[PDB]
Each structure stands twice: as structure tokens, then as C-alpha cells.
Write a protein that binds this ligand. Structure first.
Ligand SMILES: Nc1ncnc2c1ncn2[C@@H]1O[C@H](COP(=O)(O)OP(=O)(O)CP(=O)(O)O)[C@H]2OC3(O[C@H]21)C([N+](=O)[O-])=CC(=[N+]([O-])O)C=C3[N+](=O)[O-]
Ligand SMILES: [K+]
Ligand SMILES: [Mg+2]
Ligand SMILES: [Mg+2]
Ligand SMILES: [Mg+2]
Length: 994
């Protein structure tokens, strides 16, 4: 039954056909279960199935490397008639890397969700119904509640379904709806229909919503909606329809691959076309394969040589360590490339209740009467530190710690807060936090008493369980609560009747403690207490009170105020009737004013500073709450979204205000406004969608069910640890300790990750360029091969593979978060940076062939051949006239190849130092800054000196120990690459941009 809110109670009972007193007949229950089903959502699919491994292979970089692994495998398997390993090793080790690259991927999010599921422990939901089976109320399974079921709820009960209220057994019924509507205060329910057409759940005050909590009172209702049809279920399907693209980092790596897939196709056809004349016609050789496609085969192999091969591992490595860093900061991350997405965020959309605030009422201000000199009235005002239900906090007077006990007025103020209270404080030892029992407004008073400690009770050696109501149990030993006068709307206050206990100080008679709305309570006061003494209510005194209450009610410190009073001479209890609550206001007269407490749903202490750090980084914060506008504006002014006296007007919109604007004017209002209040869960995603329409990477921070669709819509969703389950599943990042200052740390991380990522990409791609140039120059000049694929394989994975990993530990700049977020359209690799590594890449290729050629001609240790003999080494034969005094085996010597390899590994160690910064000289920013890099240089160089002197390795890498003087030549070739990059860096500093 949809829209049950807009229909009368008797109209709802007719829809299912069930008496209010009897209940559902088992015949009806059986029919109502086949026409509506079980009250539950589809099974939780937070299980990482083994089909989600293909998601790790959606990255085309891995796919390119996978494709390059397959086209490097086939040409060596069916050709050349050689089953050696040299051509076979690279095919499977690439495949061995990729399968291992996918391991960490499906293990990270698996380890993540196992920590997210740990956040909420199993507490099976139940429900209380009335049926024709038994007259007594029977507690049944929550899932077995059908629409049309007569359901009663009491204080503390979690509403099992979307229920239309029928009758409120108590005077008033308060319902906490923070997790669904973001409403900071509990709502009072009625039974009358709401004929509002465009009504939000917040306007539907005649129904109970599933998932919400009952604050106070009890009522009996009719279930109008169950299962996925409920307001929670509607959102579950709402986010199920919500679709998001790949993470900004993941899609930025993809476009780099599309650029690398082009040069892979470019050099594949370039080598194929330059050898024209030989191709496009069958020549002497290769008749088994028509067309002589031999030139195509060597072109494909050369294209594969351009792939950094080791790169898809060094990237995942960098993200992996950056993830556990956040884990140290109690931040759980779903996907690996989601650790960067917060580093390129332009707008952070945050929810209010539960996210920006603790969602726990806290008494922060509090005053009593100090002196009454007829015309002069002074007050004793106090401040209370805290922001949670925890008994942790001290009472201050004029920002100085005081003992509440030495104030007689405060002792009585506590006595009222402890006795006139139907709520308690409990310590959830499972979650390790303090939770409320009943109404938040009263629990705040309970917390206040525990913090005050008016009798100075030692509580040091008490467990957190019995600490929750320690100071309150001391007060409750003094007076005996005879009965309580429940809250009523016409009066807006409540009171309790108390008689002394244990005959202690029986000189005084019974008392009556009252609390309620200030103006209403004070109007019924005739006396004000000054410590222990009482004086009449004078005009000036009356004014001094109301002036402060009005001040605390608005402005700088907008609070929820509450006046506290006692009735020194209460009526005899036999002359009081507790049947009609309209008599209660009269009983609460001739009162004595004691004091007033100020409370609010306070912002988290880390929120204000975090917002400023985001602003300094150029990240605009925007509040999106379902709470009323007044509270929203007030919170914004405290955290720094708005100024103390800043004129908001159309920088803040409500649900209706925003829904009345045309679509064109709606998206333009999302770049101006920074506060949207009284907002449906639908609008939250729409605001995110609008910000994304201007190509802005926007984040979302929430905790409630109404935040779920927006948490999923954003590029990155951030869920609070003390939030709903659906919010946790809809997000990628989960703050485990609700620390808001973790976000700004995840921004610095994401900016440090991306910057370092550009570095070891440029570092690895430059090496492969040199290799391609080397292989090409060899085939161009007809020289002996300088580098064999087995050597380059070892290099790109080990020797310059892990120094690239050490580049992921480059120190963050000081100007890392004083600059705006990077541009979305801005590419990972630019045309300038392309030329930059292509220039040093070209040098590497020319240096490698030059090193080997040096050994053949001008090296004293070498044969000293001429250039013609070197370029015609294949025409060499025994006793060849043009090769006099030379063995043709000298062109297969391992010594010149060692030169080409030692010049390659050394030129990368120098390039590693240049890869420290992008535009900073080594003279300005010294190379001894990164100690992680230097360690990688030594280890890789250690292996290089290990790969020459060990003896078995030179026999498989075709190498030999280098000469003591020949090493000096290597340094005279490798070192200039520093000066090359230093030149490129020089015309970058204030010459490329200045
Ligand atoms: N309009 C109203 N309708 C119903 N109750 C009201 C009320 N206005 C105040 N109260 C009751 O007045 C107090 C101050 O209002 P506050 O928080 O400053 O709001 P204001 O700005 O002054 C008025 P606004 O809505 O036009 O903006 C409130 O405390 C309790 O009920 C409230 C309460 N509770 O959970 O909220 C619980 C409770 N018990 O016992 O559980 C008792 C209250 N009480 O007053 O006794
Ligand atoms: K997300
Ligand atoms: Mg290779
Ligand atoms: Mg919230
Ligand atoms: Mg108000």
C-alpha cells in the first residue's frame, strides 16, 4: 500500500481487512505473504566472487602487455626450430607477472570488505506484532512481518517496517530518523493524514519508517509496506541503478595506453615500410610463407620491445603501500586506484548529521543565578567541553576548570537532570563507545551529570560500563521517584514527583523537579534560587534570564535551551490525577527557577580545521543535509563554510526551492551554493551529477541511508565508520575512526602518489625507447647485436625496475597542497614530457651502440677493426682477405655486449637521480635527498657486479667481466645524460613557464 500517509487510519485497515484489536488471521497472513513476500532485501552481495578477476584485466595496460605476451609467444614456438629458453622466458614471466598483478588486486578489496563487514556485527532484527493466534504480544522475526500486520513499538525498538501509525498509547511519540532523513532532532508523530502532494518523508509525520529508532513513548500501527518496497529498499534499488565510471586514475592510465598503443602500431609499420622493395614481392627466401612477411615479424617483435613490461607491477606496488599508509590512519580503501582519486578532487560534498557532526546531543553551555540585588541580576555561566555522550569532559567557568560541587546552584541543577529523566547511558562494549538509551535530549543531560560530578565521587578505577551511570546513581539514592508527568504538546515540559529516601534530611517535604521550554517554564516560576536560598521572581531577574536564553538560542552559538525548575511545596499526591495530561501544566506552577542548559548536535573537532586545509588546497566543501535550513546554516558558520556575519540568501537552497528552479538554473546553482538543506536522497545524487556536468571530480562524505546514492555517484565515496551498512557498501573509502582530518591526509597522499607515478613512468618508458633505438640502429648500420632480449628482460624487471619502485618514495613538496587540484583534461604524459624522455631515450640508444662499437675499433683491449669490417661482419669467414688477422668469432664476443649493457644499467642510475624531480636541478635539489633511491641504486648495481663475476650468469647472459679501465669509459658516456636532463630542466625552470 503506497501513499498510506495520505489516507486515514480507518482507510488503511480496510485496504488489508484487519481489526485493530484482534490482528491478522493466519489465513490472511498466508495470503499476505504470497502477495507481498518477506520483509527483507535481496541477499547482501558483498562477496568477491572468482568472476571478478576479469575486472583486474579491464586495464588495457595489462591487456596490451598481455597481448604483447601472446604475440611474443607464438613467433618463437612454431618458427626458427629452436626450443631454447631465451625466446621462451619472456612470454611466461610476463604472464607470471600479470597473474600475480591480479592477485594483489583481488586480495586488497577482499581484505578491505572483510574489515568493513567487521565494522557492523550481527544483531538479528526482530519485531512485535498482534495476530489472531495469541492475544498477547508475540515477538516474531522481522523478516516474517507482512503488510497489514498490527505492530506495536516502544522506546528503543528499531522500526521493523514502514508503518502507518494507528494509536499512540503514550501522550507523545518521539522518533529518531537520523539515518534516513538526516534530521538532527527526533520528530513527534501524530495520527492525522497528510494531504501534501509533494511530501517528503520528513513531512510524513504520521508514519514510522523501517530502520529508524523510537526515542520515547509507545504506539501501535499498521504495516503498509515491507521489503524492498520500503523507504530503505527504495534507496537500495536507487543506488543499484546508480552507475559510476572508472576511477580518474584508472581512466588516466588507460589514455596513456591508448597513446602507447599508437606508437606500438607506429613503429610496427614504420620498420615494415622502410624495408620496401624487399616486401610487396616474393624474394629469394621464405617461400613456405608467401609474401615474405619476415619484415612484419621483426617489426612486431620490435613493437613489443617498446612496452615497459615491468610498469604494470611498479604501479600496483606504489598504490599498495599508499593504501596501508591510509590503513594506518584508520582508512579502509576498496579499490587500489581509489587511493589517488581524492588527490584530484575539486569539490567535497559532505552530509551534516552523522558526518560533519557527531549526531550526539551535547550540553556545552549552562548557567544559574549568582547574585540578586533587587535591580541588579548577575549569572554564573559555565561551559562544558565535549561533543559525545561520553562522561569525558570538564566544566569551565570563564574558560577555567572549576569544581561543580562548590556551586550550590549546580548541585540542584544536576539533581533535576538526573531525576527528571526517563533515559540512561549505556556503554556498547562491542563497539567500544557510549550509546544513548531513549531520547538524545535526555541522554545529553545524563552525560552532563556524569561530567559535572557535583558530589566529587571517585570513579577512576571503574569500568566504562558502570561509569556510564555512576554519578547519576548517586543522585537517585537521595530522592525517590514516586511518579512522572509525561511530556505534552500543549505544555511542552515534563516533571517528576520525588520524596526523600532513607529518612535523610526529612525536615524538607516531597519535591517536584521540572524541565521544559524556557519561556513556558519561567512563566510558571515565582521564585528563583540563588545557590541554596530562594528569592522572588523580579522583573529585572526575569529579563536577565530571557535575554541570555534568547542569545543562546540564536547567533554565534545557536543552541537548544532548556529551563530547569523545582516545586518546593508540591501538592499532596492523593490530590493529583494522572489520567488527563491537560491537568499537568497546572501541577507545574508556583515553581522555583534553578538554571538553563544549552545543547546542540556539535561538529566534530577535526572538521573545522580540515575544511580550511581543503580551502588552502583549493577544494570547495559543500554541505548537503536533509535537516532543516536553520540548523544547516548554523553548522556551516561553525565549521567555516560560511562567515560569522556573511550574507547567505541564494548560496543556500532547500529541497523545494531547488526543485522549483528550472533544470538550466539548477545546475548553475550548484557552483554558487554551498549548502542544501531539507534534501531528499534523490537530490543529493543530482547535486553530485550537476557538479560532474562541469567536469569536476567531486567526492561525497556521508553516513546515512539517504547518502548511499550520492556516495556511489561520486568519483570517490567516503563513509563514516559509525554509519549505515548501505553507506559503507556504496563507498570506496571508509573512515574507521570517524576522523575527518584523515581525508585531508588522503588528499596529500593522492597528490604525492600521482606525482611520483609520472616519474617512474617517464623513467621506465625512457629505457625501452633506448632499447628500441638500440635494436633499430643495430639493424640500420649493420653492426653486431649489442643487446639480446634476455638481458633487456632482466634489466627492465630488476636493474632499473626496483629503482623505479624507490621513486615511489620521493619526498612530498611543500607546495603540494598550496596549489589547486590538477586539471581533468590534463594528460598523464604531455607532448613536452614526451619529447623529454624521447630525447634521453634517443641518447641511451646511441650510447649503447657506441659503447660496443668503441670496443671493436678504438679500444686497446679490442681487435681494433675498421668501420667497414664491423659493418660487414656477416661476410667474415676463415682466412678472409678483408678480415686479415681476425677470427670471425670476435663478432660474437661477450665483451663488447658487456659494454652495451653496463652503459645501459649505469645510464639509468643517473636517470634515476634526474627522475627525482621534474624541473629541479641536482644543484638545487641534491640527489642525496631520497635515501630509498640510493639503496635501490646500490642493490641493482650490486646485482650488476654480481651478474658478471659469479660465473654461471655470464654463460646465460653472454657476458664477461669488464676491464678496470673500461669502466672509466662507461662513466664518460653515462654521466652526460645528467647534463642532458639538466639542460632540459634548465629551460623548464622559468623558461617554459615565465
Ligand atoms: N515547537 C515545539 N513542539 C514540540 N516541542 C517543543 C517545541 N519547541 C520546543 N519544544 C520542547 O522544548 C525543549 C527546548 O526546545 P528547542 O530544542 O530549543 O526548540 P525551539 O527553537 O525552542 C522551537 P522551534 O521548533 O520553533 O525551532 C525541547 O526539549 C524537549 O522537547 C523540546 C525534548 N526533545 O527531544 O526535544 C525532549 C524531552 N524529554 O523529556 O524527553 C523534553 C523537552 N522539553 O521541553 O521538556
Ligand atoms: K564511489
Ligand atoms: Mg620485453
Ligand atoms: Mg548523515
Ligand atoms: Mg528553534
Amino acid at each position: 500500500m503506497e501513499a498510506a500517509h495520505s489516507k486515514s487510519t480507518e482507510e488503511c485497515l480496510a485496504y488489508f481487512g484487519v481489526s485493530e484489536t484482534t490482528g491478522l488471521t493466519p489465513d490472511q497472513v498466508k495470503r499476505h505473504l504470497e502477495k507481498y513476500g518477506h520483509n527483507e532485501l535481496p541477499a547482501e552481495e558483498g562477496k568477491s566472487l572468482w568472476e571478478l578477476v576479469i575486472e583486474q584485466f579491464e586495464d588495457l595496460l595489462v591487456r596490451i602487455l598481455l597481448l604483447a605476451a601472446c604475440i611474443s609467444f607464438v613467433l618463437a614456438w612454431f618458427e626458427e626450430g629452436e626450443e631454447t629458453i631465451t625466446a621462451f622466458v619472456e612470454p611466461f614471466v610476463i604472464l607470471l607477472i600479470l597473474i600475480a598483478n591480479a592477485i594483489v588486486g583481488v586480495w586488497q578489496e577482499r581484505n578491505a570488505e572483510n574489515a568493513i563487514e567487521a565494522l557492523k556485527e550481527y544483531e538479528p532484527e526482530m519485531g512485535k506484532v498482534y495476530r489472531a493466534d495469541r492475544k498477547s504480544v508475540q515477538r516474531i522475526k522481522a523478516r516474517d512481518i507482512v503488510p497489514g500486520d498490527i505492530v506495536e513499538v516502544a522506546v528503543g525498538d528499531k522500526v521493523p517496517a514502514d508503518i502507518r501509525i494507528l494509536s499512540i498509547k503514550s501522550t507523545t511519540l518521539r522518533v529518531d530518523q537520523s539515518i534516513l532523513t538526516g534530521e538532527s532532532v527526533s520528530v513527534i508523530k501524530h495520527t492525522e493524514p497528510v494531504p501534501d502532494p509533494r511530501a517528503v518523508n520528513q513531512d510524513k509525520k504520521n508514519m514510522l519508517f523501517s530502520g529508524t529508532n523510537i526515542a520515547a513513548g509507545k504506539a501501535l500501527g499498521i504495516v503498509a509496506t515491507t521489503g524492498v518496497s520500503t523507504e530503505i529498499g527504495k534507496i537500495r534499488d536507487q543506488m543499484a541503478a546508480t552507475e559510476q565510471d572508472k576511477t580518474p586514475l584508472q581512466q588516466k592510465l588507460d589514455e596513456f595506453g591508448e597513446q602507447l598503443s599508437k606508437v606500438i602500431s607506429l613503429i610496427c609499420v614504420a620498420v615494415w615500410l622502410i624495408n620496401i622493395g624487399h616486401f610487396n614481392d616474393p624474394v629469394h627466401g621464405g617461400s613456405w610463407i608467401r609474401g615474405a612477411i619476415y619484415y612484419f615479424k621483426i617489426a612486431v617483435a620490435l613493437a613489443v620491445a617498446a612496452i615497459p613490461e615491468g610498469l604494470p607491477a611498479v604501479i600496483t606496488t606504489c598504490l599498495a603501500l599508499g593504501t596501508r599508509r591510509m590503513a594506518k590512519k584508520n582508512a579502509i580503501v576498496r579499490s587500489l586506484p581509489s587511493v589517488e582519486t581524492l588527490g584530484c578532487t575539486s569539490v567535497i560534498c559532505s552530509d551534516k548529521t552523522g558526518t560533519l557532526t557527531t549526531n550526539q546531543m551535547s550540553v556545552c553551555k549552562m548557567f544559574i543565578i549568582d547574585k540578586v540585588d533587587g535591580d541588579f541580576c548577575s549569572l554564573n555561566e559555565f561551559s562544558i567541553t565535549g561533543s559525545t555522550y561520553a562522561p569525558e569532559g570538564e566544566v569551565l567557568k570563564n574558560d577555567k576548570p572549576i569544581r561543580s560541587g562548590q556551586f550550590d546552584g549546580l548541585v540542584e541543577l544536576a539533581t533535576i537532570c538526573a531525576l527528571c529523566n526517563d533515559s540512561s547511558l549505556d556503554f556498547n562494549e562491542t563497539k567500544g563507545v557510549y550509546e544513548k538509551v531513549g531520547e538524545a535530549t535526555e541522554t545529553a543531560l545524563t552525560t552532563l551529570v556524569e561530567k559535572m560530578n557535583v558530589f566529587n565521587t571517585e570513579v577512576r578505577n571503574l569500568s566504562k560500563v558502570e561509569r556510564a551511570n555512576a554519578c547519576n546513581s548517586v543522585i537517585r539514592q537521595l530522592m525517590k521517584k514516586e511518579f512522572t508527568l509525561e511530556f505534552s504538546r500543549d505544555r511542552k515540559s515534563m516533571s517528576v514527583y520525588c520524596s526523600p529516601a532513607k529518612s535523610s534530611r526529612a525536615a524538607v517535604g516531597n519535591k517536584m523537579f521540572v524541565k521544559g521550554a524556557p519561556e513556558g517554564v519561567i512563566d510558571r516560576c515565582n521564585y528563583v534560587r540563588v545557590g541554596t536560598t530562594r528569592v522572588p521572581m523580579t522583573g529585572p531577574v526575569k529579563e536577565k534570564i530571557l535575554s541570555v536564553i534568547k542569545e543562546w538560542g540564536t547567533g554565534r552559538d545557536t543552541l537548544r535551551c532548556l529551563a530547569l525548575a523545582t516545586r518546593d511545596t508540591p501538592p499532596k499526591r492523593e490530590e493529583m490525577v494522572l489520567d488527563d495530561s491537560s491537568r499537568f501544566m497546572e501541577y507545574e506552577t508556583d515553581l522555583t527557577f534553578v538554571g538553563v542548559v544549552g545543547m546542540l548536535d556539535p561538529p566534530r573537532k577535526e572538521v573545522m580545521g580540515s575544511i580550511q586545509l581543503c580551502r588552502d588546497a583549493g577544494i570547495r566543501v559543500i554541505m548537503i543535509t536533509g535537516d532543516n535550513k536553520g540548523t544547516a546554516i548554523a553548522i556551516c558558520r561553525r565549521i567555516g563554510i560560511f562567515g560569522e556575519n556573511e550574507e547567505v540568501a541564494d548560496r543556500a537552497y532547500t529541497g523545494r526551492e531547488f526543485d522549483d528552479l528550472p533544470l538550466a538554473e539548477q545546475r548553475e546553482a550548484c557552483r554558487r551554493a554551498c549548502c542544501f538543506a531539507r534534501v531528499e536522497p534523490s537530490h543529493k545524487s543530482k547535486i553530485v551529477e550537476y557538479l560532474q556536468s562541469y567536469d569536476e571530480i567531486t567526492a561525497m562524505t556521508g553516513d546515512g541511508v539517504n547518502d548511499a546514492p550520492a556516495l556511489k555517484k561520486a568519483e570517490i565515496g567516503i563513509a563514516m565508520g559509525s554509519g549505515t551498512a548501505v553507506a559503507k557498501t556504496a563507498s570506496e573509502m571508509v573512515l574507521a575512526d570517524d576522523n575527518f582530518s584523515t581525508i585531508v591526509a588522503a588528499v596529500e597522499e593522492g597528490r604525492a602518489i600521482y606525482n611520483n607515478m609520472k616519474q617512474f613512468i617517464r623513467y621506465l618508458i625512457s629505457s625501452n625507447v633506448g632499447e628500441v633505438v638500440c635494436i633499430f640502429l643495430t639493424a640500420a648500420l649493420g653492426l653486431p647485436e649489442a643487446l639480446i632480449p634476455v638481458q633487456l628482460l632482466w634489466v627492465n624487471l630488476v636493474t632499473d625496475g626496483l629503482p623505479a619502485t624507490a621513486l615511489g618514495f620521493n619526498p612530498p613538496d611543500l607546495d603540494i597542497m598550496d596549489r589547486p587540484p590538477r586539471s581533468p583534461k590534463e594528460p598523464l604524459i604531455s607532448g613536452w614530457l614526451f619529447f623529454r624522455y624521447m630525447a634521453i631515450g634517443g641518447y641511451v640508444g646511441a650510447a649503447t651502440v657506441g659503447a660496443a662499437a668503441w670496443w671493436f675499433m678504438y679500444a686497446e683491449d679490442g681487435p681494433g677493426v675498421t668501420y667497414h669490417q664491423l659493418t660487414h661482419f656477416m661476410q667474415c669467414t676463415e682466412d678472409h682477405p678483408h678480415f686479415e688477422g681476425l677470427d670471425c668469432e670476435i663478432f660474437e664476443a661477450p665483451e663488447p655486449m658487456t659494454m652495451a649493457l653496463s652503459v645501459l644499467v649505469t645510464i639509468e642510475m643517473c636517470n634515476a637521480l634526474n627522475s627525482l624531480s621534474e624541473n629541479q636541478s641536482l644543484m638545487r635539489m641534491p640527489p642525496w635527498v631520497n635515501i630509498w633511491l640510493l639503496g635501490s641504486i646500490c642493490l641493482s648495481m650490486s646485482l650488476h657486479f654480481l651478474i658478471l663475476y659469479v660465473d654461471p650468469l655470464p654463460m646465460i647472459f653472454k657476458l664477461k667481466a669488464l676491464d678496470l679501465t673500461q669502466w672509466l669509459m662507461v662513466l664518460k658516456i653515462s654521466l652526460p645524460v645528467i647534463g642532458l636532463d639538466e639542460i632540459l630542466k634548465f629551460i623548464a625552470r622559468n623558461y617554459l613557464e615565465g
